[model samples]
Target: KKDDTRYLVGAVPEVDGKVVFSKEFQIPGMSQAQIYDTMTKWMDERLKENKNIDSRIVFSDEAKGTIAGVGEEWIVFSSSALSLDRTLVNYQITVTCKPGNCLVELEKIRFTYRETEKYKAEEWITDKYALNKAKTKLVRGLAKWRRKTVDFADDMFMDVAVAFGAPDTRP
Candidate 1:
């Protein structure tokens, strides 16, 4: 089994600092046209992610990067959900591409750990925190969210390679 260092989530106590997540890769000799093409591929993937959950993407030629859209993966629990269910987390993911390699960072995160029970739903959380502590109901899902986001970003990176008929680096 992979060690904790490779573990995506399901670990110890609350993090002292922000639970921010970021990933970067170098596709040496990759071109801008290829990067732009991959952006379209990434956007296509993001569009495939649309499922009425929470999708907000901004892609502008007038802009420098693309804000990856919210995928259908994240849970969409609402006020009506009596028991523990979906939790919402918003984040901004940007890709800065140069001629050879690219960089991706997911930041400006807004996540929470919402808890609801069968009989007690006092709802102590009224404000959104930058990170969810280990005690909150949102924590587990947050871990799940982290796993999914990282996987997707990583997947998109390798997908770029495959898009150009290059070797698939995915494991």
Candidate 2:
């Protein structure tokens, strides 16, 4: 795919499994209420937690929720995760559950970049050679944003994994 920038995609990969769902994380013994807390609980705490940093729950619910905030640039999330020129693209982590286990899906990760004039600037990386070429501000921002965004997403994932306490070895 190196030869073709067109294949380069979002901040993170999209992976689904046979047993789990969406790069799912399994908690040995957790409840639906607890699972949902992973998002809502974090939302308030995180929002207030990052009082200095511009972070907020963009979209949230029992199904899934998004957390958007300011952070560094980008990086490689995973093989299946899409890469984009949109740096530090605000993203959300969602928890899909069935009482005992859950799948925290990072949703619509390639959603925004620098928001100027207080307006949301959402975008996707272009495949054109000129634009994709690494050197300009946009391309550089893309790479930086991807790197940081991936870190942010993974950090959130770890939070959820730990939030439920621990898991079974089988999972």
Candidate 3:
């Protein structure tokens, strides 16, 4: 849990400041790569849609010296695929099988802002609060990432299942 602090603390947040969200559904009859692709595409699209996001760079330039930009590496882990990078501010998706269903884990999908000295002073709070806020955003972002990934996976599964004459028993 101590080591996980760094990863969990550096997450992004939704526009409305929600902390966590999730959705799960069966993705039957689709290859892992297919599912991975669906999730990646979904995240990319969502990032583009975020009005606060600056697609010109991975991490916000203003956060260069702040905790948000220091040693940040976006990671995605799954049985089907894994990806990690430092140059893109986006989500990563991992897909695994769970008995009768596929489980997709999407993470690192949030808007992160570096806590500059000026911002910290302006907020007039302890450093712990800043760190806590960062952690909160990260967790929320991961949750949203998972939710969207599941939605896309479910939709893709339905399309493929219908096209290939498989059962659409996803729920």
Error of 3 at 35 (Å): 0.4
Measured by TM-score, the strongest candidate is 1
Candidate 3 overall lDDT versus native: 0.35
User: Residue-wise lDDT of candidate 3 within 2-72, one digit each (tens)?
Assistant: 23332333222222333321234465666545554444444444445444434312331111211011112
Ranking by lDDT: 1, 2, 3
Count backbone clashes in candidate 1: 1
Error of 2 at 10 (Å): 9.6
Candidate 1 lDDT over 1-171, as tens digits, reads: 322232223322122343334445566667755675676667566656655545545553413544354432344443364665554445555666666655655544454445432210112211132125433333343344444444554565565556556687556
Models, CA RMSD each = 8.3, 10.1, 16.4
TM-score against native, each model: 0.50, 0.48, 0.27
Please report, in order, the local distance difference test score of every candidate based on alpha carbons. Answer: 0.46, 0.45, 0.35
TM-score of 1: 0.50
Off by over 4 Å in 2: 1-11, 14-23, 52-89, 110-141, 166-171
Which whole-number lDDT from 0 to 100 does residue 103 have in model 3? Answer: 42
